[PDB]
Amino acid sequence: RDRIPLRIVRAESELSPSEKAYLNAVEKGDYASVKKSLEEAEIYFKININCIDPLGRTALLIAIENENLELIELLLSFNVYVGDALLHAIRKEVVGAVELLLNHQFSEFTPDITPIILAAHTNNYEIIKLLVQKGVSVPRPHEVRCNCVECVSSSDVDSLRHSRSRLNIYKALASPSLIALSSEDPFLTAFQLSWELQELSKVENEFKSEYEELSRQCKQFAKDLLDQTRSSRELEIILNYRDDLARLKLAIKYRQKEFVAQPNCQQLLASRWYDEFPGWRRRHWAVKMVTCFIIGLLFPVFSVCYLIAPKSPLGLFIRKPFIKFICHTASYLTFLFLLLLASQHIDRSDLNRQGPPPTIVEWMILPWVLGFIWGEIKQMWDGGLQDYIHDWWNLMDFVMNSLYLATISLKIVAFVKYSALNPRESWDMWHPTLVAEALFAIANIFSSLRLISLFTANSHLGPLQISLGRMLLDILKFLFIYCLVLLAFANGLNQLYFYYEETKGLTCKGIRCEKQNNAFSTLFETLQSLFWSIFGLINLYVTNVKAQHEFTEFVGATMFGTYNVISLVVLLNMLIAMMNNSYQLIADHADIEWKFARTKLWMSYFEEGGTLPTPFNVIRAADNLRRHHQYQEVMRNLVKRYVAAMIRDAKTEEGLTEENFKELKQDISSFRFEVLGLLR
Amino acid sequence: SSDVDSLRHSRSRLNIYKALASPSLIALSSEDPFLTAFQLSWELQELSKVENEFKSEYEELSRQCKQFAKDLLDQTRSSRELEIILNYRDDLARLKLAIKYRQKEFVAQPNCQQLLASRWYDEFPGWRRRHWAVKMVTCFIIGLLFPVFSVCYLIAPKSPLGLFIRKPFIKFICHTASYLTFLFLLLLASQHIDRSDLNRQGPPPTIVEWMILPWVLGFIWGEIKQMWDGGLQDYIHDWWNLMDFVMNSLYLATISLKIVAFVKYSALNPRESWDMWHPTLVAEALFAIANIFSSLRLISLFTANSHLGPLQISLGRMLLDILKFLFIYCLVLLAFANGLNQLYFYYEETKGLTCKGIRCEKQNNAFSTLFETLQSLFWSIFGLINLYVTNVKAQHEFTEFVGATMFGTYNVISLVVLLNMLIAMMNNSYQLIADHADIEWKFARTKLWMSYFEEGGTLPTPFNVIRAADNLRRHHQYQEVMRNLVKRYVAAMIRDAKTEEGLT
Amino acid sequence: RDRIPLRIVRAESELSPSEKAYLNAVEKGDYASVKKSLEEAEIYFKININCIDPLGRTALLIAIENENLELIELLLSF
Amino acid sequence: EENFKELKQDISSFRFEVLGLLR
């Protein structure tokens, strides 16, 4: 044998020539031929009414695909096995599914698929409304964090079916047409559904993209729903609705970035940000800088008026959120400026004083440290503990405050434990004064690096700062890989060099001086020398041995050279490849991320909790019924126009497929035969 | 036939394979479309390698065959059907067959991965729903008890304590915990926990090294069994297997040299006056190199993690691009090393110095010899070679200028040109690898997962050294299931996609 | 309870079976049926001429969407 | 989809009157 004898292996049962003509008449829309053949079948029992084409299409399915309502009615007049024809009509999005609804095995749909679930998948408003008008219900899925005995038992029996059924239910519930129809509050339903779908993607490692797409679709629906507001009164009603912008705060907690960054939503927020401050967005940039500078210089007098004279014209200026931000920023700059003055030695503090009294500059630095702690305490008071620890900057603030407390405690300890004359060069090296200065210096770095969080307010540094933060997570991933490589070579280099590098009597012991002696004596020294070789600060004589062991020296330098190639040529250049690719993904929708972050910064100054800056902070049924009606009224309009604008128009702008061409031939072919039948 | 008409023969062969690779023909006339698609994709991939021309056409045909198998498996709607298909053989025999055929899309199917995760976490419910802090705590305490779990497995088979280790997830944790203890012991060896002196020419093994030895024997013992239960072709396919062989070879040389030094040198001699080729010196050198390889083996464990997994796979797939520039850079490096050594080998014959080379404060002879020239040129990438290395004791400023210009030209080519060109590749390379990176990681994670499914390596490294009726029934139940899959695949993919085709 | 009882919350006012047929005739371009139904509306006051489909399309809007100038002229006659 | 929906209308408008004219 030299040829492949192709043969039918599975295929399907063949069709009689009469049956093939009968199905061909259904495809061609020949009503007279189909009616005659069906009448002959019920009187001669020759052909099978429920014959199946090679592609798996029966007579009813062919008529449904061509949307020949007359043919469907003719077939339904006889005893045609409907089977899953209703699902096929729903999937094909044929509005003439009413005939199958009120009409007194191998399936292309899973057994868990119901007409309502499939209708919601198709996102057809007319079909969904038709089914909901009748008796229709959807099985309710269990929570993401569920421990039901039935849930685990069902998954154990069939894991594939359980996952598919759960995905199908959530796909049906996430359809905007179903939410706009059967949901009491579609804005709240979309917020909760996106949260649940996002949690499912994290829990279900498989089908992560499907769940993420469903959550993104829910987030998009809420943004499109809010896009239908045409008056500022409607926007205020929706955003302030609660069961203060309570609904806007709810959207923030659900990470509805698209909803928050809506142009109308941002415009209203900017009005609250610049309340009673007209023309700020139209002034020159030089005027803006001058006005902000003079306002910031007068932050203490504004806080003094707020404390002394409430509800006063001078005390009402600070209540503006924009003025709060400027005054708070000006307070932080003064604190940072005082930190620079502390290192500048404005007042004499001597050098040999073991326990020094606090400097005059440090004396008025202390209220800011107490104010920062006082403000952080109130952050956990008015706000929830879950939200307090969510922010990354909150952890950074806690570290800075902890370092400041240790500095104050060590300064107090040194004051009350050391009161004798002793030159600095002959101290303990673990002196409380030395540790206090070290922790103060570290806290100064964190205090000055806190100004990055203020970049969100600016329109130019805002999107950049957010992008760098979102890209820092990629650096953390290479910290694991580099450290594993760093520890691998540090282990090898220390193992080789710890015999010879036992030299004593030198001025130094390590790498941090002119004569770098013991680069790989210990594991700690090996790690430092390997770390500093990235920047080229480790010379080549660190691999030398006093003994004339050139083979050991060559191996050590080759191991040092291999690390340099891997870390610098390979790892560093690989790191660049990620962040360049990472930014291309982050560059798009970077405005949405910044606007969401800027909104959170803006609403942090809306309330009265932190009106005072850091240094000076230490010194029903009828109304509820009315709001529900006015929210439902407004929401009725939004859903109605959303359906007309998005659901209807997008379907009209949909592209043309082969089914439409196949359809157009059927109407011509149906008009083809009866005109010939009528004329002849 | 090819000699008579090469163009016709190539076109005829491509047309035949294009016809055979059509999913409609496979779903119709093939006895086992899953096996036919696996074999056809393998054959088409081999043809692309052999036929340099029409490589894209053959690669597209193989990709189409791989896509058909993934779409065919996408039609399973019950877990019983998936188990029947994946366990079918002529253990997941069909899944293993797909792995050997590099059916990454077939392996990384969400339903296929879900069943594999169930086997990975068998009798361990709620692991995927627990908090990350709980996961870390549970893994840590389980890993700390790896010796007691292995002891129970050896002492008490089919016992409640001895059945916990049989879980593949527990095997991975216990094996990982075993490797970390071995790596921790390697750090202790360099930390000099016990006194080993310094002038002992032939030293007895340290107490720390005494219990290090079982791991080395266990690693060799486990590697031997890897070639026993598994095929030799599959044993050498894995890159990490070659890395393990190098690490084991270095450890054997260290043990052999330590034994040789013990039985050949037993006299007092300070270390600074040794041979420089002493067996103790070579043993320490090879032990240090093996320590680097042993600790770098932890990269292969990154595949299990969902975050470090795709990253690690991408870097490995990108390392091949670095190897391509190793040829180009070395050619440039050897070109300038030849020129610099030719110019500087007359003058740089100085003697009587403390040093001879570049690895000290006074870098004397950077280009005396070809070996020294290569080292000095290599170290100039990181800026560790100073500018006085191009100076001559003689007042030959023209020769010095030419040598520094040749040194300067190499620096521009290697750093400004070659290094920046290398960045351009990997940035473009990642953009290609960034897509379908999840499929590559999931395929690699699957191979790691099934490596713990069988009983071949249940014990960790330190403790490893201490019919017709049934066949007929399986064929019918596989064909039954396969009949349903093909029937619904034709209706869902072949029919519906044609209806959604564009209008011409 | 373990199932979600989907119900109509806002939707829109329902259509009479005669009104549904009247709008269906406008969509299908049946000039004779539309003219007869419109004539019956002005003599029997049974169906609403300005009935609205679930999607928010009235009889005039449906004819405009299909660009049936004859249907628009017929509707504008009444 | 509007163009396809349109093309059906002209056929459907020509559908009924020809039937009305013949019958």
Ligand SMILES: CCCCCCCCCCCCCCCC(=O)OC[C@H](COP(=O)(O)O)OC(=O)CCCCCCCCCCCCCCC
């Ligand atoms: C996830 C990542 C994991 C790690 C992946 C690593 C992939 C492999 C990376 C390469 C490692 C092998 C090469 C190491 C060579 C070495 O250390 O070599 C170091 C030795 C050091 O010599 P001494 O010991 O005498 O100082 O150099 C020599 O012996 C002289 C010959 C040098 C030839 C070097 C050839 C390769 C250089 C590659 C540099 C590329 C620069 C590109 C821009 C100009």
Ligand SMILES: CCCCCCCCCCCCCCCC(=O)OC[C@H](COP(=O)(O)O)OC(=O)CCCCCCCCCCCCCCC
């Ligand atoms: C596949 C790749 C193959 C190789 C391809 C090579 C392409 C050509 C690459 C450039 C080579 C020619 C330039 C070499 C100049 C040189 O060696 O110059 C080296 C000499 C060294 O002088 P000494 O000998 O006195 O030290 O410099 C001088 O004589 C003084 C004038 C310097 C002018 C340099 C102008 C070009 C510099 C390019 C640097 C670009 C830096 C960009 C970022 C800032």
Ligand SMILES: CC(C)CCC[C@@H](C)[C@H]1CC[C@H]2[C@@H]3CC=C4C[C@@H](OC(=O)CCC(=O)O)CC[C@]4(C)[C@H]3CC[C@]12C
């Ligand atoms: C050593 C001390 C004195 C600090 C020196 C630097 C500061 C003067 C700089 C550093 C970061 C700057 C900030 C970076 C970003 C912004 C946001 C941006 O805000 C606005 O445009 C106003 C609010 C808004 O409309 O959103 C411009 C001011 C501000 C606070 C900047 C004010 C000046 C700051 C604090």
Ligand SMILES: CC(C)CCC[C@@H](C)[C@H]1CC[C@H]2[C@@H]3CC=C4C[C@@H](OC(=O)CCC(=O)O)CC[C@]4(C)[C@H]3CC[C@]12C
């Ligand atoms: C000096 C010694 C003590 C080593 C120090 C570093 C180790 C403690 C680190 C380095 C790499 C880490 C591994 C990197 C990746 C993974 C995969 C990942 O696996 C899982 O999440 C569980 C399995 C799965 O579900 O796939 C997390 C654990 C593990 C083994 C990590 C365990 C801890 C390791 C071995």
Ligand SMILES: [Ca+2]
């Ligand atoms: Ca804070």
Ligand SMILES: [Ca+2]
């Ligand atoms: Ca191996």
Ligand SMILES: [Zn+2]
């Ligand atoms: Zn439950």
